[PDB]
Amino acid sequence: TEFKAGSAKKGATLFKTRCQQCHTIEEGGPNKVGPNLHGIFGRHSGQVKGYSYTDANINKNVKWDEDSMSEYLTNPKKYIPGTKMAFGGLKKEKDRNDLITYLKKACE
């Protein structure tokens, strides 16, 4: 594909307003409705310890990158049918760019 960096401040607010409801992102933050996402780009789907994932996400075995991430957030279920993440998606690239910007920084 093609992915460009947007704004990490903007990505920050999007997170707080769209993801934080179900996820933490900090090193050592708790699993909640969703799994903790710290360190995600160095991992594959369904590997956070103690988190109960659907068969769907485990089997998908997604190696998370800025590119897999942009497609996933477009529409989570289209990408991972069976997934229990209840989020419609981020339709705008601009939106996904900003957010993945932040994630990439914050997840490391």
Residues engaged in binding ligand HEC (CB under 6 A): 18-19, 21-23, 33-35, 37, 40, 45-46, 48, 53-54, 56-57, 73, 83-87, 90
Contact 100, 108 (CB under 8 A): no
Q: Closest distance between ligand HEC and the C-beta of residue 54, in Å? A: 3
Q: Which among 5-13, 27-35, 36-44, 61-69 is the span making contact with its own copies, rule CB under 8 A?
A: 5-13
Contact 15, 102 (CB under 8 A): yes
The CA-based diameter of the chain, rounded to the nearest angstrom, is 34
Binding track over 10-49 against its own copies, x by CB under 8 A: x-xxx-xx--------------------------------
Instruction: Tell whether the torsion through CA atoms of 53, 55, 56 and 60 is positive or negative.
Output: positive
Instruction: Tell whether the torsion through CA atoms of 82, 85, 86 and 92 is positive or negative.
Output: negative
- Asked if residue 7 binds its own copies (CB under 8 A), the reply is yes
